[PDB]
Design a protein around this ligand. Structure first.
Ligand SMILES: O=C(O)CCc1nc2ccccc2[nH]c1=O
Length: 167
């Protein structure tokens, strides 16, 4: 048993809810929250900007030190950093950004990072401002992630559509 509440079960291991991932992280304090990161760990907008703002910019300070030491992530890659006040850990995962022209086939590689963690609170990768089709992102998630994932969908109207179209 875990502390996640009000989720619709989609599969054996994937759950979904209409929720603000920041508010959800603050309530649950999960072991792992996933960030919709870019390769520079520049947390400006979407889930990254919102998560970073909730940490009072401590996420960005830690991220800048990580990049200064290690250089940029790969598209499809990830790193584990602190969860600050939101979670034990933050898994920063880089899905492909369609609005920058990145290969959508890298979305499966991005979701494979989730399999290194038994339970995660996450957004849909490559969705929203990343420019990919969220229905596609949910399908790749269900077909790739084998660990237990609690998906927070921010947009109410998109959520109504993801549930009603899910196969
Ligand atoms: O809802 C999410 O969690 C996915 C990212 C996202 N997609 C949208 C699509 C259309 C309109 C608003 C949107 N807001 C969003 O946050």
């Amino acid at each position: 048993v875990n502390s996640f509440s009000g989720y619709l079960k989609l599969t054996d291991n994937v759950y979904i809810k209409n929720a603000d991932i920041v508010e959800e992280a603050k309530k649950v304090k999960p072991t792992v929250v996933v960030n919709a990161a870019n390769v520079y760990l520049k947390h400006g907008g979407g889930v990254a900007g919102a998560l970073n703002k909730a940490t009072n910019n401590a996420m960005q300070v830690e991220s800048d030190d990580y990049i200064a030491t290690n250089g940029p992530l790969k598209v499809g890659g990830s790193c584990v950093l602190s969860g600050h006040n939101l979670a034990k850990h933050c898994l920063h995962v880089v899905g492909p950004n369609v609005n920058k022209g990145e290969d959508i086939q890298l979305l499966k590689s991005a979701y494979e990072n989730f399999n290194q963690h038994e339970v995660l609170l996450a957004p849909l990768l490559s969705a929203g401002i990343f420019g990919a089709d969220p229905i596609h992102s949910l399908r790749v998630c269900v077909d790739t992630v084998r660990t237990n994932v609690y998906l927070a969908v921010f947009d109410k109207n998109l959520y109504d559509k993801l549930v009603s179209s899910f196969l």
